[PDB]
Design a protein around this ligand. Structure first.
Ligand SMILES: *[C@@H]1O[C@H](CO)[C@@H](O[C@@H]2O[C@H](CO)[C@@H](O)[C@H](O)[C@H]2NC(C)=O)[C@H](O)[C@H]1NC(C)=O
Ligand SMILES: *[C@@H]1O[C@H](CO)[C@@H](O[C@@H]2O[C@H](CO)[C@@H](O)[C@H](O)[C@H]2NC(C)=O)[C@H](O)[C@H]1NC(C)=O
Ligand SMILES: *[C@@H]1O[C@H](CO)[C@@H](O)[C@H](O)[C@H]1NC(C)=O
Ligand SMILES: *[C@@H]1O[C@H](CO)[C@@H](O)[C@H](O)[C@H]1NC(C)=O
Ligand SMILES: *[C@@H]1O[C@H](CO)[C@@H](O)[C@H](O)[C@H]1NC(C)=O
Ligand SMILES: *[C@@H]1O[C@H](CO)[C@@H](O)[C@H](O)[C@H]1NC(C)=O
Ligand SMILES: *[C@@H]1O[C@H](CO)[C@@H](O)[C@H](O)[C@H]1NC(C)=O
Lengths: 184, 96, 232, 49, 147
């Protein structure tokens, strides 16, 4: 037999611009590493980096010739960041044939080679796969980075081509080498 | 009975009984007013859960529901609730 | 009471930066070399239609025209829009207003009934574009200093966005608002119209639209539009 | 001109291939996430296909 | 056989998940409907039309103040990510036992006669008690229900 203090709400979604809803949170931006981002609705995945472009003050993001997003404006500090993809490539296996031996060398294309143990999941791989991420046999070429072969200073004919003047063969006990090819 | 289809949302399909998105079978439903109305209160269903159910998985617990920040231990105080709520079935209701 | 445009009424269609790129877009534009009605108020405020968008430009010198009425029936039964400059603030109001058949504001007149919301924020050629798509009211503008004889110039300059509004009125007609001295209550502006065209814009090294090509003006400009270049 | 045409033809073909990612082919959008964060899974698998 | 074979691809995986959004400025005026001076009776419940603002529902749900909170179609953790064109708010004065009929499908003194939630609902109810300051001594004949 005591008074109450009631408040009752109800919503509508008749087809119109929605002018009322709740707050959308934020985190703090991190640069120079591969993240998933959400800049005001625009989603993606890449590496954020301080830029040189100057937008016009009403423009929110930039595009290139094939219409991909490659620059964005942060909506709190109004600066311009770059977008660059997280690195990818192919994995190629160099073998001398299984009628002869069983040791191989692995080429990782376009890596810079210090990123190899972390681009592959070398902590999560087999211990027989972890040999080909780190070692003494690490060689950086224009075609990528070659791990598992010995960079000699001779020159022979090409046996298994790699690219940009580099070949690889199985002679020398026996091992897998990597050399600049000779023309004659 | 709308929510006993694959890929549904609500409270039956989210807290009580979840069918997988790849289902192979039949769902059979019929009106049973002449045996479940006296309102009966032995027909119970959950209201809150920490997350949604996996397909074909059960949950039987009356551990009470915390929603704010107070770690309520057996106390149905402010912002701490009891999951199981019951229907009320009588011929005074329309179809639905 | 008629003149043409020569290159006039091009705006930035979206908020995307592009540098040193020709880009082809399809949107509502005012066509090149087209007849606009000229309203010189010498002795002039009729009720013009709002078909799908309106161009507006005024060669003023001394702050006469202040704002616009929009809406459909003007009868304070259905909703209408209002824009007024009170020499310090730009008031935008969406209500059922008391409407004179010759309405103005003398050098003083407003209304309020059962309504939704409000928003508050001769070297003078001020250009405007009003557009009403999918529940949003859009306004683009630019001003530039001119001294030609009377009419619109021949140069090229693009119209930046000003404000977007979430209003949601069916808009059918509109008319202007001037400032005049005598309050005679009795109970130099141009108007174009937008069509669904296809243009080819040229962004320079800083993101500014520098030139455009109307892809249906003549057979030479359709060659520039398929080759995607400004030279053939 | 015979060597310039081989470079222009290969760049035209790679440009068309990347610009074909902005078409929706009958779906509601051309973005994978806006199909996913707008529809429920049993009929977001016909807009992805 | 002897050669070089392309067997797989690699890709560096993302580590974090950032979100950037503009500043939160234009809040909704809930102080007008939760800290008002006086209220109105049952049959003459006042309506508030709330539009064009951001609404914080977590401070209403976590208030340490009310006694009633129940709703249908929404949960209090979904309310911060779902949008509407218009939200209405009603508030009035009722008694102790006159509260449980405020739901879809009930009858009472004032449920089917003054204030009914229709066949399905979306919004939520919030209630506490008013004998702390809204009942003077010597009787209170200042708010008027329907018979
Ligand atoms: C959004 O709000 C933040 C929080 O205040 C603003 O950040 C501050 O801006 C001032 C400029 O007036 C700087 O001096 C401060 O260093 C900033 N940081 C802090 C922690 O105070 C930010 O400018 C706002 N963004 C807008 C309005 O676009
Ligand atoms: C109604 O008004 C009271 C103040 O009389 C508000 O209570 C305070 O809210 C602030 C907001 O941060 C808290 O910091 C205080 O701890 C609260 N209590 C006191 C005693 O000051 C209350 O939030 C208001 N309710 C609304 C606006 O819905
Ligand atoms: C290589 O393959 C041939 C094919 O039959 C086989 O006879 C021979 O044993 C293999 N091994 C050698 C030559 O070491
Ligand atoms: C590869 O690593 C070297 C070592 O510092 C660095 O100088 C160079 O910029 C890197 N090249 C890249 C990232 O393309
Ligand atoms: C190959 O020659 C280069 C040339 O300076 C030398 O630096 C390098 O040590 C040589 N590699 C050897 C000896 O393995
Ligand atoms: C446009 O103006 C020209 C010259 O004033 C006139 O000849 C023509 O009839 C007008 N109307 C159209 C539709 O071109
Ligand atoms: C474009 O930007 C450059 C560099 O800031 C500036 O020098 C130039 O004035 C700008 N405008 C042009 C080229 O119209």
């Amino acid at each position: 037999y005591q008074p109450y203090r009631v408040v009752v709400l109800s919503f509508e979604l008749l087809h119109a611009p929605a002018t009322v809803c709740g707050p959308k949170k934020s985190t703090n931006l991190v640069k120079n590493k591969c993240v998933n981002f959400n800049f005001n609705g625009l989603t993606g995945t890449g590496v954020l980096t301080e830029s040189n472009k100057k937008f016009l003050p009403f423009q929110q993001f930039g595009r290139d010739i094939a219409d991909t997003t490659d620059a964005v404006r942060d909506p709190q500090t109004l600066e311009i960041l770059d977008i660059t993809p997280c690195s990818f490539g192919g994995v190629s296996v160099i073998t001398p044939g299984t009628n002869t031996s069983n040791q191989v060398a692995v080429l990782y294309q376009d890596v810079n080679c210090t990123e190899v143990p972390v681009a592959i999941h070398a902590d999560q791989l087999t211990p027989t796969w972890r040999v080909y991420s780190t070692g003494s046999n690490v060689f950086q070429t224009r075609a990528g980075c070659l791990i598992g072969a010995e960079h000699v200073n001779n020159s022979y004919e090409c046996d298994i081509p790699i690219g940009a003047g580099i070949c690889a063969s199985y002679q020398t006990s026996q091992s897998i080498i990597a050399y600049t090819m000779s023309l004659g | 009975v709308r929510q006993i289809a694959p890929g549904q949302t609500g409270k039956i399909a989210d807290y009580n009984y979840k069918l997988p998105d790849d289902f192979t079978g039949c769902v059979i439903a019929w009106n049973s007013n002449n045996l479940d109305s006296k309102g009966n209160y032995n027909y119970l269903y959950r209201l809150f859960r920490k997350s949604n159910l996996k397909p074909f998985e059960r949950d039987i617990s009356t551990e009470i529901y915390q929603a704010g920040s107070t770690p309520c231990n057996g106390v149905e105080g402010f912002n701490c609730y009891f999951p199981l709520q019951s229907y009320g079935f009588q011929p005074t209701n329309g179809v639905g | 009471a008629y003149t043409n445009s020569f290159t006039r009424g091009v705006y930035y269609p979206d908020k995307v930066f592009r540098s040193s790129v020709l880009h082809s877009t399809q949107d509502l534009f005012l066509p090149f070399f087209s007849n606009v009605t000229w309203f010189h108020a010498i002795h002039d405020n009729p009720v013009l239609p709002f078909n799908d968008g309106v161009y507006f430009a005024s060669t003023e010198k001394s702050n006469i025209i202040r704002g616009w009425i929009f809406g459909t029936t003007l009868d304070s039964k259905t909703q209408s829009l209002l824009i007024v400059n009170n020499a310090t603030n730009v008031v935008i109001k969406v209500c059922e207003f008391q409407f004179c058949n010759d309405p103005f504001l003398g050098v003083v007149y407003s209304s309020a009934n059962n309504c939704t919301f409000e928003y508050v924020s001769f070297k003078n050629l001020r250009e405007f574009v009003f557009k009403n798509i999918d529940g949003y009211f859009k306004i683009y503008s630019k001003h530039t200093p001119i001294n030609l004889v009377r009419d619109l110039p021949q140069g090229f300059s693009a119209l930046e966005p000003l404000v977007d509004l979430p209003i949601g009125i069916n808009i059918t007609r509109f008319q202007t608002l001037l400032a005049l001295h005598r309050s005679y209550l009795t109970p130099a502006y141009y108007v174009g119209y937008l069509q669904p065209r296809t243009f080819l814009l040229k962004y320079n090294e800083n993101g500014t639209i520098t030139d455009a090509v109307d892809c249906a003006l003549d057979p030479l400009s359709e060659t520039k539009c398929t080759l995607k270049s400004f030279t053939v | 001109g015979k060597l310039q045409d081989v470079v222009n033809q290969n760049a035209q073909a790679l440009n068309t291939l990347v610009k074909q990612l902005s078409s929706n082919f009958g779906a509601i959008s051309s973005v994978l996430n806006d199909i996913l964060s707008r529809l429920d899974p049993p009929e977001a698998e016909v807009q992805i296909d | 056989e002897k050669g070089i074979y392309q067997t797989s691809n690699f890709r560096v995986q993302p580590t974090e998940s950032i979100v950037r959004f503009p500043n939160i400025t234009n809040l909704c005026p809930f102080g007008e409907v939760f800290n008002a001076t006086r209220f109105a009776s049952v049959y003459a419940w006042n309506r508030k039309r709330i539009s064009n603002c951001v609404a914080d529902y977590s401070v209403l749900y976590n208030s340490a103040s009310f006694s009633t909170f129940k709703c249908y179609g929404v949960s209090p953790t979904k309310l911060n990510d779902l949008c509407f064109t218009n939200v209405y708010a009603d508030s009035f004065v009722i008694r102790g036992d006159e509260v449980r009929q405020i739901a879809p499908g009930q009858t009472g003194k004032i449920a089917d006669y003054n204030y009914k939630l229709p066949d399905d609902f979306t919004g939520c109810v919030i209630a506490w008690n008013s004998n702390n300051l809204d009942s003077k001594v010597g009787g209170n004949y200042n708010y008027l229900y329907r018979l």
